[PDB]
Amino acid sequence: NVFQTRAGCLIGAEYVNNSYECDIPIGAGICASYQTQSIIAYTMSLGAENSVAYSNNSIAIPTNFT
Amino acid sequence: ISVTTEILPVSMTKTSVDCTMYICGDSTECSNLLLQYGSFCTQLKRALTGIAVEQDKNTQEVFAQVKQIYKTPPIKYFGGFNFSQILPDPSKPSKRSFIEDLLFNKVTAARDLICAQKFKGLTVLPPLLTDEMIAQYTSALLAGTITSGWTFGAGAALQIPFAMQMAYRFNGIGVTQNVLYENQKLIANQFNSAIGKIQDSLSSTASALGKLQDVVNHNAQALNTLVKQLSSKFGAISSVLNDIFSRLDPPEAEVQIDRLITGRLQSLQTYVTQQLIRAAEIRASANLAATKMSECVLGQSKRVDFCGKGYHLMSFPQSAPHGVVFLHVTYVPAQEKNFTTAPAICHDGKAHFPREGVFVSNGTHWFVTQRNFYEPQIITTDNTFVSGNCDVVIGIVNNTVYDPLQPELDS
Amino acid sequence: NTLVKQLSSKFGAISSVLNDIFSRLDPPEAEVQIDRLITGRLQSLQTYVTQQLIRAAEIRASANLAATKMSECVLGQSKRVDFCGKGYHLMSFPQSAPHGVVFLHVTYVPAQEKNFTTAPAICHDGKAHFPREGVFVSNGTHWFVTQRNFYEPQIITTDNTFVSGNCDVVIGIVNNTVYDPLQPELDS
Ligand SMILES: *[C@@H]1O[C@H](CO)[C@@H](O[C@@H]2O[C@H](CO)[C@@H](O)[C@H](O)[C@H]2NC(C)=O)[C@H](O)[C@H]1NC(C)=O
Ligand SMILES: *[C@@H]1O[C@H](CO)[C@@H](O[C@@H]2O[C@H](CO)[C@@H](O)[C@H](O)[C@H]2NC(C)=O)[C@H](O)[C@H]1NC(C)=O
Ligand SMILES: *[C@@H]1O[C@H](CO)[C@@H](O[C@@H]2O[C@H](CO)[C@@H](O)[C@H](O)[C@H]2NC(C)=O)[C@H](O)[C@H]1NC(C)=O
Ligand SMILES: *[C@@H]1O[C@H](CO)[C@@H](O[C@@H]2O[C@H](CO)[C@@H](O)[C@H](O)[C@H]2NC(C)=O)[C@H](O)[C@H]1NC(C)=O
Ligand SMILES: *[C@@H]1O[C@H](CO)[C@@H](O[C@@H]2O[C@H](CO)[C@@H](O)[C@H](O)[C@H]2NC(C)=O)[C@H](O)[C@H]1NC(C)=O
Ligand SMILES: *[C@@H]1O[C@H](CO)[C@@H](O[C@@H]2O[C@H](CO)[C@@H](O)[C@H](O)[C@H]2NC(C)=O)[C@H](O)[C@H]1NC(C)=O
Ligand SMILES: *[C@@H]1O[C@H](CO)[C@@H](O[C@@H]2O[C@H](CO)[C@@H](O)[C@H](O)[C@H]2NC(C)=O)[C@H](O)[C@H]1NC(C)=O
Ligand SMILES: *[C@@H]1O[C@H](CO)[C@@H](O)[C@H](O)[C@H]1NC(C)=O
Ligand SMILES: *[C@@H]1O[C@H](CO)[C@@H](O)[C@H](O)[C@H]1NC(C)=O
């Protein structure tokens, strides 16, 4: 296959629409890995997505330690 | 309440050099002759690759410090503080803020210089992280510090109202919470005015980003001198080698070629050494920036003149071309007044020392007050402790102490 | 290894060894080849020394950082964030390794959080009450005071609260009762 990235042209890798942690950095936010029996090039995932409940009169207090 | 700006460089520009094109051009005879000098280019490639990976390591260490990406809730009330200029703006396609846009715009037929340098074997590689990812990291850090506080730097993010967070920080610097709870509106107005002044200064002044511009200028000057070195004879007949080959016989052409090769190799060596030194300095700056990010943004620092000039309250990060910008919010006293003091109070033949504050007098009476704010109170046994008689301490004075129990005995 | 391998270069001379150069050419002419070889080898060795100096400087910086970490994290307790580990620092231990040190950091991390409703101050008898070293919480029916980093509810009293001003200036104040521990024993 052929793929056009801002770092050039990539031949031999198939582009997928998922996102994983980077294994081999190619550049411009594009990384590559060996998975599935094949080589897949993907876009980096910064991390999990979270939201915090904020209001005038709410607090969170811990009840245990480690 | 004061807001101060700090600028720190983080990374550099990644470069790659092609030996054969730079030295021998498009001549095959020089290409054949070059092999005699051994392995002089594998070392150069290794050094440049090391610098290139070092830059990405620097950026990742500085910015990637949060495991989860947070978002601010749609409601934008934070106790009167605006924050609308430093939070992401969804309208623009870059998902950036006003100050970030100003900072990026601040630092900047015919053929472009980049193409001309590329056509001689000097190329620039792209960084691993785009600007959007750095913006997302900055937004996540801002959301975490606004909503959770410093709890997200040591575990899970626990929500807390902004006013109570400010009260905790005031307690940290050494002032009680009632000051904030009674001057919330004034503090919010001061913060908004300071942010507006920062806006005006950024929009007007164009010389506050010197360090990143100096980095860019140094890189440009190094490339310029490397390119200019190609047009010097080094003691030969001419710089152009085809004329040397055509004009005169091989016996002296070999000497001329050797002179040119030695000169160009020496120039490349000098360039690599200067690049190594500059990269070491940039890495030191990046380490300092990472430490500052971990100490001033994810917590409160007691160190003096580290996270701002004054008493530190908190800080905010923003991105910049090849660098980071810190907005420090700090506390400074004003409108001071003179008073008369004593070290202890001798009452009932016993010495009395304050528990938290200091003793003051306004001319006739005596009070106890906190250190960083004028708030007098009557000297009682609840805010005083006794140790020994009053004939040893130098400078003790006479007064009376109030006991909150005897009034209740008779009433 | 690369310094050793550089010895096979010719640097434009007729051979990579000296004895054959001295055993094939007259003294008037061998000088140019000897000069070329000597200059090349000197340049290689100088480059090696310079790179060694730069690497030594970096190692010195790392050693200074390790010394500071040993001074603060091990011999004492550090309040710096993310310096002696992730979390709240408790203590640390050193161990040795070939050309390096290994630090084991023992730290404290909260877990098992729970939601609560809070107010900044309590209005009682026309006066505002603020916590001393805690925070006000409520479980939907009653009110308590608890420490920040652990759950330990307690009854609001005079001993753990202080008063300043009226209750018509603080935003978010609520009405409740503050228990006086002097009258009940006085009236008994
Ligand atoms: C805090 O967590 C510890 C474990 O991380 C809890 O200890 C366990 O509690 C469960 C349920 O009470 C018991 O069945 C286990 O035997 C306990 N020990 C272990 C090793 O699992 C502890 O109870 C938690 N604190 C509170 C207040 O529940
Ligand atoms: C926060 O700051 C923004 C921008 O400075 C304020 O929006 C301005 O509001 C005034 C009047 O309310 C208008 O005249 C301006 O045109 C507005 N500017 C922009 C850029 O929108 C906003 O009022 C401030 N306060 C809050 C609560 O958002
Ligand atoms: C505290 O007292 C000092 C000394 O009395 C004041 O300093 C003097 O202030 C007057 C102005 O009223 C000046 O003319 C003198 O020159 C000052 N003396 C010196 C040595 O500088 C000081 O102003 C008082 N504090 C305040 C807040 O007024
Ligand atoms: C020092 O502070 C005392 C406060 O105790 C002042 O005394 C008060 O003065 C006002 C005058 O407006 C009277 O109405 C109050 O009754 C006074 N208080 C008491 C307890 O009698 C005093 O004026 C201040 N200044 C000096 C120089 O003593
Ligand atoms: C503070 O009060 C004490 C009360 O005992 C003073 O002590 C006496 O003061 C009188 C008056 O000058 C003297 O005649 C006594 O000799 C003092 N007694 C002793 C044991 O020294 C004390 O002087 C007062 N403080 C000041 C600064 O005068
Ligand atoms: C909020 O906390 C109070 C204080 O503990 C709870 O009141 C107690 O609830 C237990 C539950 O069985 C009773 O045995 C006690 O008699 C109650 N004490 C008092 C003084 O009423 C209350 O139940 C808690 N609320 C909720 C919703 O859990
Ligand atoms: C706490 O109690 C006071 C009374 O001690 C409440 O003040 C009353 O507020 C109502 C309005 O809902 C007025 O009509 C009354 O005149 C007020 N009383 C007095 C004596 O001024 C106060 O509202 C209570 N707090 C809350 C949050 O409801
Ligand atoms: C409570 O939060 C709402 C938004 O959820 C806000 O409009 C209101 O002003 C807040 N109340 C106080 C007292 O801050
Ligand atoms: C607190 O309430 C929010 C509101 O949805 C919830 O997401 C969160 O899980 C709650 N916290 C706990 C500890 O249950």
Residue numbers in the entry:
A (entry chain A): 641 to 676, 690 to 719
B (entry chain B): 720 to 827, 845 to 1147
C (entry chain A): 960 to 1147
From the paper:
As the spike glycoprotein of SARS-CoV-2 mediates the virus entry into host cells, it is the main target of NAbs and the hotspot for designing therapeutic agents and vaccines. Omicron carries the most significant number of mutations among all SARS-CoV-2 variants to date, with 37 mutations within its spike protein, 15 of which are positioned at the RBD and cover almost all the critical mutation sites carried by previous VOCs, such as K417N, S477N, E484K (E484A in Omicron), and N501Y. The Omicron spike has 37 mutation sites, 11 located on the N-terminal domain (NTD), 15 on the RBD, and the remaining 11 near the furin cleavage site and on the S2 subunit. To delineate the impact of emerging mutations on spike’s properties, we performed systematic structural analyses on apo Omicron spike and its complexes with human ACE2 or S309 neutralizing antibody (NAb) by cryo-EM.
To explore the impact of emerging mutations on the structure and function of the spike protein, we determined the atomic structure of the apo Omicron spike at 3.03 Å resolution using single-particle cryo-EM. The apo spike preferentially adopts the one-RBD-up open conformation. Its overall organization is similar to the prototype and other VOCs. Most mutations of the RBD and S2 are located near the interface between protomers. The subunit with the up-RBD was designated Protomer_A, and the other two subunits with the down-RBD were defined as Protomer_B and Protomer_C in a counterclockwise direction. A contact interface between the up-RBD (Protomer_A, A_RBD) and down-RBD (Protomer_C, C_RBD) was observed. The interface is maintained by a hydrophobic microenvironment, where residue F486 of the C_RBD is closely surrounded by hydrophobic residues of the A_RBD and forms extensive hydrophobic contacts, consistent with previous observations. Residue F486 of the C_RBD stacks with F375 of the A_RBD, bridging the up-RBD with the adjacent down-RBD. The Superimposition of S304-bound Omicron RBD into the apo spike with the one-RBD-up conformation showed severe steric clashes between S304 and the down-RBD.
